Amino acid sequence: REVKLTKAGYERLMKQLEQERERLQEATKILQELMESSDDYDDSGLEAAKQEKARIEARIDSLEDVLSRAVILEEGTGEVIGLGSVVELEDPATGERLSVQVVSPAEASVLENPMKISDASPMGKALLGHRVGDVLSLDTPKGKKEFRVVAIHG
Numbered sequence: 488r489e490v491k492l493t494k495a496g497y498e499r500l501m502k503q504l505e506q507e508r509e510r511l512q513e514a515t516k517i518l519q520e521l522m523e524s525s526d527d528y529d530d531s532g533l534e535a536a537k538q539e540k541a542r543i544e545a546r547i548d549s550l551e552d553v554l555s556r557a558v559i560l561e562e563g564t565g566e567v568i569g570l571g572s573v574v575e576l577e578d579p580a581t582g583e584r585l586s587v588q589v590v591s592p593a594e595a596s597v598l599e600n601p602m603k604i605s606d607a608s609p610m611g612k613a614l615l616g617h618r619v620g621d622v623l624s625l626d627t628p629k630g631k632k633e634f635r636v637v638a639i640h641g
Contacts, residue, residue: 490556491620492635497557499622500579503633504550507580511543546580553579553635558620565618566639573601573641574614576634579622585634588641589615 492500518540521532568574573588586601587610595605605611613625614636621636 488556489558490553490635491558491560492622493560493562493618493620496620496622496635497554497559499624499633500550500554500635503580504547504554507543507547507550511540511547514540514543549582550579553582560618560620563618567618568614568616568639570606571641572639574639575601575637577637578632578634580633584637587614 514536518533518536521527521529521536566572568589570589570591573586576585576587577583578585587604588601589606589611590603592605592607594603595608596603606615610625614623617623617636619636619638623634623636625632625634
């Protein structure tokens with residue numbers, strides 16, 4: 488489909504491309520050193536390493552593809568987010584969709600479908616009040632995920 492975004496949206500996505508690239512290279516810069524420190528025998532290295540190279544490649548080239556479907560947006564121009572709202576998401580790097588809805592504390596669960604998550608949860612508080620094509624940064628343990636808000640149906 489078409490892929491719709493905002494000012495910070497773009498940039499904060501781009502920042503990350505720029506971010507991930509600087510990574511790929513330092514990764515490559517490792518691999519050739521190993522493929523070089525070769526008069527050795529591979530798997531601990533060539534494995535993790537080549538794999539790691541790709542991870543990022545695929546990550547990268549993923550974000551790239553996205554930012555060309557990109558259509559920018561005049562701010563404040565859209566449905567917002569409150570409780571009714573159910574929000575469809577995807578993560579720019581990896582594009583793994585994920586759909587949830589904001590709900591009063593008591594009818595909150597991970598059992599229902601488009602998961603019913605709480606307005607007083609981080610992710611609640613956190614995804615509260617943004618628009619389609621906004622890009623968010625929620626807290627993971629393992630650091631921090633970023634999602635395109637992919638239409639606030641509801």
